[PDB]
Amino acid sequence: NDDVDQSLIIAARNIVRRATVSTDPLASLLEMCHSTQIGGIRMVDILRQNPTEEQAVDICKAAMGLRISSSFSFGGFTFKRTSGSSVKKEEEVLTGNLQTLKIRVHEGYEEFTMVGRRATAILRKATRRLIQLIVSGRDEQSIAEAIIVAMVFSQEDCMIKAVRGDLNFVNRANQRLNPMHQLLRHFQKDAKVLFQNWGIEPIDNVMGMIGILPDMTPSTEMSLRGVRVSKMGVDESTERVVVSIDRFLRVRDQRGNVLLSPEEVSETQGTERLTITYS
Amino acid sequence: QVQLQESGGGLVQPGGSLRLSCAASGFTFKMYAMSWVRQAPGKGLEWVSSINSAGGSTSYVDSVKGRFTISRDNAKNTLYLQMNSLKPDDTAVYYCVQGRNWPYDYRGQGTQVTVS
């Protein structure tokens, strides 16, 4: 039932945002899940029976003790690992503005599918190195957004070096974002320096693929290094797992990896077709 | 000889409705996903909605979700966009395109929509 799903997402996004501005976001969220109705039905009743996987919806499901997808969200993209492992090593790095940054680096090859609402990609990477990104998407901005996420996730020093101011991004409670989301917010604001300094390479013009230049125009001849746009589309089930959620709505899998947080919830939403009554 | 021709734009008031049409020709329409994209004042080409070949599965940008409905009549080689609860920010030239992946090789001439 897609009207319910879409109304559920809208309600869930609104609730997660409001619960973020409190001394106990988990407690606030749960209260709001219990006090909110959609089409005249309590949200908890819908969450318990609705299969939608969306970041705010899954934060609410975790708060209620319900299983969600085992995939993590970064930059709005659901990352499903298809190779390599999760083990990471801390490193202090230095941005292009001479600000230090403590990041957690996986060593060794990994491979992911990135599934977004407006783009899909295959990401192959090694230690602090983008090997390949193959991305398809609905429009130029949506592909650019996937490319930015993938460059940040790569943790390549070219990307750290392209940072051009101090990084003091916060959430809705004015609490500072973690290092990778600092980097994500910076380049989401303006990616020109990152794209211009990343590097380009000649491409083999092959059917269904096209290059993409640092100014985000398609090219048959060159492309951002390691990046290709799929005109035919990248292909893409849900493993549902028991999760935990802490006071600040950070959701973790059994091994302690963070899957979701309020920072992974879209800032936009549709228009509900079922009436949502809050409180 | 792929040809796309949009129809149905106009000047309307907030809260109003319009129905865009796009007649396709020069390809087997039934075998292609189709999309609507738009160019609002000051901006680039932004995707609005996609629909698969059979018509059963649809996708929308958040800003139109719950207000716009994409549909298609494969018998008549026509793509539609029902725009309800129109807002000033829906002002744009609306284009029909083949497929659902950017960059779009085939785009119509556009139909202007102005909500004021």
Numbering used by the authors:
A (entry chain A): 252 to 487, 490 to 532
B (entry chain C): 1 to 116
Please quote the paper that reports this structure:
Central to the replication cycle of influenza viruses is the viral RNA-dependent RNA polymerase which transcribes and replicates the viral RNA genome. The influenza virus RNA-dependent RNA polymerase is a heterotrimeric multifunctional machine composed of polymerase basic 1 (PB1), polymerase basic 2 (PB2) and polymerase acidic (PA) subunits, that catalyzes both primer-independent replication (vRNA to complementary RNA (cRNA) and cRNA to vRNA synthesis) and primer-dependent transcription (vRNA to mRNA synthesis) in the nucleus of infected cells. PB1 houses the polymerase active site, whereas PB2 and PA contain, respectively, cap-binding and endonuclease domains required for transcription initiation by cap-snatching. High-resolution structures of the complete viral polymerase from a number of human, avian and bat influenza A viruses, as well as influenza B, C, and D viruses have been determined. These structures have revealed that the polymerase is a highly flexible macromolecule that can assume a variety of distinct conformations, enabling the polymerase to perform both transcription and replication that require different initiation and termination mechanisms.
Five nanobodies, Nb8193, Nb8194, Nb8195, Nb8197, and Nb8208, were unresolved by cryo-EM, and as the C-terminal domains of PB2 are disordered in our datasets, we suspected that these nanobodies may bind to this region. To test this hypothesis, we purified proteins comprising either the cap-binding and mid-link domains (cap-mid-link, residues 250–538) or the 627 and NLS domains (627-NLS, residues 538–759). Four of the nanobodies bound to cap-mid-link causing a peak shift in size exclusion chromatography; only Nb8195 did not bind. Crystallisation of the cap-mid-link-nanobody complexes yielded crystals that diffracted to resolutions of 1.7 Å for the Nb8193 complex and 1.9 Å for the Nb8194 complex. Nanobodies Nb8193 and Nb8194 form site 5a, each interacting with the cap-binding domain residues Arg389, Asp390, and Arg482. Nb8193 forms additional contacts with Arg264 from the mid domain and Thr524 from the linker region.
